[PDB]
Every structure is written in structure tokens, then in C-alpha cells.
Structure 1
Amino acid sequence: PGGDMSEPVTQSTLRIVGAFWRLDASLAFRRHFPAINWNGSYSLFTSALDPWYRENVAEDYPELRDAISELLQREAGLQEIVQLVGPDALQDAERLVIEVGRIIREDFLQQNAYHEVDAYCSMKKAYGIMKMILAFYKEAEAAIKRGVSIDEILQLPVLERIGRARYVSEEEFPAYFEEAMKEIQGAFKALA
């Protein structure tokens, strides 16, 4: 009834199910659909679906997922002291964690279901977007310590190529993905 997950029906169905997909009301007022709370929902089938992942989507698919999950956890812990002090006193990587976390929650963890092509997403396309995000973070954090401002790394033309990657078809996506990996690896070589 009132949000309020301490209900009898909710706590009675909560003991038996193997996946709990909590929806929010503070997260569906920004029109951020689907409104699944990624900090509070859980699954119990993750340990059992790992050999299927390793034989049918990638080989490093669970580790890439765990890196995405720990970036989301790090941004979630960091956002409260951001709401304390603002985006100023963040050191340098404290801000890059926020920007990669926002690229995650506005590219990967957001899906229209009214768009023609952004309603379905096979495991390959989600894995490609995950490799783009973690390649951007891995190759930008190593480039932020060779003397690059945080106010330079954001305005690249490849960040839009990450952001609109969820709007391409299932057939156009591998030819888009390898060229986007070339652009991410090549837009940091000229970086200074």
C-alpha cells in the first residue's frame, strides 16, 4: 500500500522467492524507467548461472558484471558526501566514479520499452555496452594521472557514442561496437 515493504503479503512472499525486484517511487519521479532499485533488489541465481554465461555470452562476463556492480556501490556510497559538500571537494577520481556511474545509470540501467529497438536487449548487446563503459573508465582513470583535467575528459565526442549505443539494432551492433572500441582507444592517445 504505502511503499512500505514491511507488509504481511510482501514479507510472506519475500521468504520464498529467489529473485526480488524492488521498484522505487523516488526513482520513477525522474521518469527513469525501469524503476528497479539497483541498491536493495537482489537475486539468488547469480552463482548458478555462471557456467551458462561462460559458455554463451562471454568468458569474462561475471567479472565485468562484478566491476559494474562495485562501481554502482562505490557511487552509491560516494553520493551522500556529494550531497554534503557538492561536486567541489571531490578529489579527482571521486568525480570520475560519479561520471561513470551516471553513464551507467543513463545508458546501461535505463531502457525505454516504447522505442522500437530499445525494448529488447540480448546478452551480447548488454555485454558490449558494459565493455564500452568499463573500457572508458579503465582508460580514463589511467589517463587522469598523466595530467588531464576532469573537465576535459567529459566533453569528448565518444561519450555520446557510448550514450546512444542502446539505440542500435541487434545486427548493427557488432560493427558499431568494434568501431566504438577503436574510438575509445584512439580518443585517449591524442589526449593531453
Structure 2
Amino acid sequence: PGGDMSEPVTQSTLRIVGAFWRLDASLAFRRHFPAINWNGSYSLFTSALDPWYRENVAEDYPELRDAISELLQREAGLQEIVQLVGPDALQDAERLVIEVGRIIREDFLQQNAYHEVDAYCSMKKAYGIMKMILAFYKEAEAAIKRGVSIDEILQLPVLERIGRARYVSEEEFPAYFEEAMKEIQGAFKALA
């Protein structure tokens, strides 16, 4: 009724189901969809599908999934300090994590059910998007130790390439990914 998930029907349902997809009214008001609360949700079928994933998608897919989950957890942890001290007090390493978490939230989790292309997404397309995001994060992490300012990293034009990747069709996506990886590598090579 009121979003109160202590009501008897929800509590009786949670004792037998194997997956729990919790929705949030806070994300729905800001038009963030599918508005899945990734902190309260869980799935008990993840450990059994790993042999299927390791031969049907890629051998390193669970590692990338765990890395994405760890990045989301670190962003959620840093968001308390962000709103209790202000974004100016954070160090550049934490600013990079905050920005990468924002990029992940805007470009991978968000999906449009009415768009003619974004309504459907294959497993390999999501794998490519995760690879691009993790490669960008690794390059930006390497650039921090070299003394590159965080403002120089963020104003790079390769950020828009990652954001627009989910709108590419399935037939054109491998050509997009193959060029985008080299674009990321060259863009982080050309500085400092």
C-alpha cells in the first residue's frame, strides 16, 4: 500500500521466491528507469549460471560483474561523505570513483523501454559496455598517478562515446566497440 514492505503479502512472498527485484519511488520521480533499487535487491541464482556464462559469453564475465558491483558499492559509500562534507573536500581519487559511478548509473543501468533500439540489449552488448567502462576507469586511475588533473580527465570527448553506446544497434555494435577501445587508448595516450 504505502511502499511499506512489511505488509503480510510481501513478507509471505519473500520466503519462497529466489529473486527479489525491489523498486524505488525515489528513482521513479526523477524519471530514472527501470528504477531497480540495486542495494536492496538480491538474486540466489547467480552462482549456478556461472558455468553457462563462462562459455556462452566470455570467460572473464563474472570478474567484470564483480568489479562493477564493487565500484557501485564504493560509490554508495562515498556518497555519504559527498553530502556531509561537500564535493570540494574530496580527494581526486574519490572524485574519480564518484564520476565513474555516475557514468555507470547513467549509461549502463538506465534503459528506455520505448526507444526503438534501447528496448532490447543482448548479453554481448552489455559485456562490451562493461569492458569499455572498466577500461576507461583503469586508464583514468593510471593517469592520476602521473599528475593529470581530474578536470582534464572529465572534459575528454571520449566520455560522450561511452554514453551514446547503448543507442547503437546490435548489428553495428562490434564496429562501434572496436573503434571505441582504440579511441579510449589513444585519448589517454595523447595526454601527459
Greater helix share, 1 or 2? 2
Cα-to-partner distance string for 1:4-61 (whole Å, 9 max, x where unaligned): 1111000100011010000000111110011000111000000000011001111100
Per the normalisation by structure 2, the TM-score is: 0.99
Counterparts of 1:5 and 1:149, CA distance in 2: 45
Task: Give 1:148 shift.
Answer: 0.5
User: After TM superposition, which residue ranges in structure 1, 4 or more long, deviate above 2 angstroms?
Assistant: none
Superposed CA offset, 1:105-129 (max 9, x none): 0000000011100000010000000
| d(CA) in 1 for partners of 2:92, 2:156 | 18
SS in structure 2 of the partner of residue 2 of structure 1: coil
For the residues of structure 2 that align with 1:150 and 1:86, how far apart are their CA atoms? 17
Q: % of aligned pairs identical?
A: 100
Q: How many residues align?
A: 192
Q: By how many angstroms is 1:85 displaced?
A: 1.0
Listed as ranges, the gaps of 5+ residues in structure 1 are none
Deviations 1:38-89 (A, max 9, x none): 1110000000000110011111000000000000000001101101011111
The runs of 5 or more residues in structure 2 that have no matched partner are none
Shift of 1:145: 1.1
TM-score normalised to the size of structure 1? 0.99
Aligned alpha-carbon RMSD (Å): 0.6
CA distance in 2, matches of 1:79, 1:48: 32
Measure the CA separation in 1 of the matches of 2:3 and 2:191.
48
Offset of 1:98 from its aligned partner?
0.6
